[PDB]
């Protein structure tokens, strides 16, 4: 058919079989870099916004609000201009010319703020906006907002059903929200009824799920896997669901991704070099040998030409 | 980082 604007051109993501990686086929990635503003993120950002609407909360010329520069920014930015929003992001003074052209370049209000204050300062400024005049603006807080999840369990979830015919045994997700590896959970064992295994991946550097589970003391730290790690866990990760978390250092990560480049012709970012890193673990294990394992790629490697990627 |  023909979308009505890009948003709801979302999804529909190829399914490839890795030859370099896992044992006798047995590992696929889903590619989301094949999207709208190029990640995931589309997903999301156009089922927010969505559901805004539908909800009330989000009306014309209302402004969209929020302190993202990542893939999430990004994906709002571009449902906001083929909506017809104002949107601002705030953002450190600090981020990435690069990031900032990009941003601008699709109609974003962007407010920089004080190098030192970094995320929190940012974070700040986009909840100070909104509540200097709350009627005008709305913050849709990928964090925590269900329509998140929802888009995964709508879209994403079947999509994997569907391609594979069923036969997806394991879902090997990074957690940046816990949004897709909710959603994709939520769907196939819910809605398609079958016990797959879910598999949450974060940074080994990060560990927080694994020392939640653990009952361990929580103890974020830096890490260089863009868009999973966030040092917290987030309420659009539904613990529930998750059967297994694997942890991934940032080296390996890239390392990874590289690979997926240069062995495989998929032009992974560095998260994708994760969650392929940990996929590749699992399956080479015996209890895998016959199982389908599924794994999403979040982004494309352009997005990380200025990173240690290259 | 939560810049996601």
Partial sequence: ?310 | NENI
């Fill in chain 1, 1 to 310: 058919a023909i979308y009505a604007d890009n948003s709801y051109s979302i999804g529909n993501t190829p399914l490839v079989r890795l030859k370099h990686f896992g044992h006798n086929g047995n590992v696929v990635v889903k590619i989301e870099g094949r999207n709208p503003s190029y990640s995931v993120k589309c997903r999301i950002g156009a089922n927010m916004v969505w559901q805004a609407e539908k909800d009330g909360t989000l009306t014309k010329g209302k402004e969209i609000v929020d302190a993202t520069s990542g893939n999430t920014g990004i994906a709002l930015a571009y449902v906001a201009a083929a909506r017809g929003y104002k949107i601002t992001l705030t953002m450190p003074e600090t981020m990435s010319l690069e990031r900032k052209r990009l941003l601008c370049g699709l109609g974003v209000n962007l407010v920089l703020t004080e190098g030192a204050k970094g995320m929190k300062g940012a974070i700040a400024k986009a909840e100070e906006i909104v509540a200097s005049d709350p009627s005008r603006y709305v913050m849709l807080k990928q964090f925590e907002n269900p329509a998140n999840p929802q888009i995964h369990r709508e879209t994403t979830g079947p999509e994997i059903w569907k391609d594979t015919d069923g036969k997806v045994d394991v879902v090997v997700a990074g957690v940046g929200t816990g949004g897709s590896i909710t959603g994709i959970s939520r769907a196939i064992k819910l809605d398609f009824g079958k016990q797959i295994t879910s598999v949450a991946v974060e940074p080994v550097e990060s560990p927080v799920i694994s020392q939640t589970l653990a009952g361990e003391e929580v103890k974020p730290g830096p890490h260089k896997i863009q868009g999973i790690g966030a040092g917290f866990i987030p309420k659009n990760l539904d613990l529930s669901i998750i059967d297994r978390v694997e942890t991934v250092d940032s080296d390996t990560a890239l390392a990874t991704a590289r690979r997926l480049m240069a062995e495989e012709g998929i032009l992974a970012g560095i998260s994708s070099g994760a969650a392929v890193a940990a996929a590749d673990r699992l399956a080479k294990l015996p209890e895998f040998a016959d199982k389908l394992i599924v794994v999403i790629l979040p982004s494309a490697s352009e997005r990380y030409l200025s990173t240690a990627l290259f």
